[PDB]
């Protein structure tokens, strides 16, 4: 049951390098990334999934120097996911999304398709022209994906840790993301915790609902 | 089976007003809100849970103007959750979080507690003093919570729809959020879909992994 999952999941502080995702699990984590919801189904994201030693080493370059504590997590986990946001919402992407919805049979008529496209452009233009927050808006959808992913992987019986503790400039440069139109936001190592994971045995802590939650 | 949940969940376009959350479900959705992870366990959020006719009507004020299509969703769902972010990360909140971790037994020594506080302040100060993006940083954690919540509620067998299509100024004013130190970001009606939910029967559409996903 999902509440048990939410109450028992934790941020893993150390991974067992010998314990790999099964082939099926490796496919399932990709499914989770793909099928996250997003505003206007804008899907303003790219994922780097590192599963080779070479690949994980490249991601771990972002943790060198000041973020060194993050390196072992990135190197010892089975699979490491880099969540990236688009840096601009371009017309090519908008067309890609609506054309895909059309290919998947979501529109009964050309008018319905046109209306969907118009609505998505309205929202996108509002963020870029009026709110001046389009980069932030897209990054928010990526964080939503991350939240979906963390619960999803826990429910698959996998350990994980979300990481903001890395140098995004280094990671962006390593994978040439800027030129491709993306920027790295969160790194999520996924695998199985080791006996050295001190956080596996500690009680969860959250503020009480009397502070955070109002019922009306 | 969480993958089945992810593949089958959808954004509900119309709710059956007669179909209420069970008492236990109403508690479980609150648990999901509370137990979401966040960077440094900063939990920079407040939730309004509207379950009365009066309460939902107050939220539905925000579906004015361009956002009229959101009104029925907000009024007809069993429970409506307003996800809010803090407007600034203050020292009182940082102390609240570490003191709660201490009360929950996460620190073996005063030194461990002090180290946790120091680490949290380092990260928080980076955002508020250097990047001047603490508002954005906090809003990102809230969107992560939303992602967790949407999958969680689906796994409970509940329908939902995330909504950016509302007037945050109207909502903030209605609940006096600004003065309390919060701002509304996403509204999530939760309940059961009606036969009028045209999105319940439509195929789900996502961009292919050959565009969005790189394996290394
Ligand atoms: C942050 C966010 C905001 C959304 N806002 C709205 C909204 O205002 N109205 C609406 O009908 N759908 C809204 N949606 C639903 C999206 O259109 C939907 O998630 C997307 O088309 C993918 O479809 P699915 O959720 O059925 O998988 C929102 C989704 C997200 C993630
Ligand atoms: C966006 C985000 C970034 C995080 N970055 C790190 C990190 O860099 N290093 C780390 O050890 N934990 C990191 N965490 C884990 C949090 O400390 C953790 O989620 C929080 O303390 C709650 O504990 P739990 O995840 O075990 O429930 C991050 C969490 C989130 C949501
Ligand atoms: O996804 C949608 O349908 C949507 C998102 C934002 C605002 N209005 C609609
Ligand atoms: O939650 C953490 O431990 C954390 C968050 C951001 C950066 N470094 C650590």
Author numbering:
A (entry chain B), B (entry chain A): 2 to 217
Quote the original article:
Escherichia coli NfsB has been studied extensively for its potential for cancer gene therapy by reducing the prodrug CB1954 to a cytotoxic derivative. The natural substrate of this flavoprotein enzyme is not known; however, it reduces a wide range of nitroaromatic compounds to hydroxylamines and also reduces quinones to quinols, with a bi-bi substituted (ping-pong) enzyme mechanism. The enzyme is a homodimer of two 24 kDa subunits with an extensive dimer interface. The two active sites are on opposite sides of the long central helix at the dimer interface, and the FMN is bound to residues from both monomers.
The most active mutant selected was T41Q/N71S/F124T. While the N71S is the only mutation at position 71 that enhances the activity of the protein for CB1954, the F124T mutation is not the most active mutation at position 124, and the T41Q mutation by itself reduces the activity of the protein for CB1954. The mutations together, therefore, show synergistic effects. In this study, structures of the double and triple mutant were both determined with and without bound nicotinic acid. In the triple mutant, the N71S mutation is the same as in the double mutant; position 41, however, is now a Gln, which is larger than the wild-type threonine and more polar than the leucine of the double mutant, while F124 has been replaced by threonine. In the structures of the free and nicotinate-bound triple mutant, the Q41 side chain forms a hydrogen bond to the T124 hydroxyl group, pulling the residue slightly closer than in the wild-type protein. In the structure with bound nicotinate, the Q41 side chain interacts with the nicotinate ring and is in a different orientation to the side chain of the L41 mutant. In the structures of the proteins bound to nicotinate, both L41 and Q41 interact with the nicotinamide ring and are likely to also interact with CB1954. The crystal structure of the T41Q/N71S/F124T mutant shows a hydrogen bond between Q41 and T124, explaining the co-operativity between these two residues. On replacing N71 with S71, in most of the structures of all the mutants, a water-mediated hydrogen bond to the FMN cofactor is found from the Oγ of S71 instead of the direct hydrogen bond from the NH2 of N71.
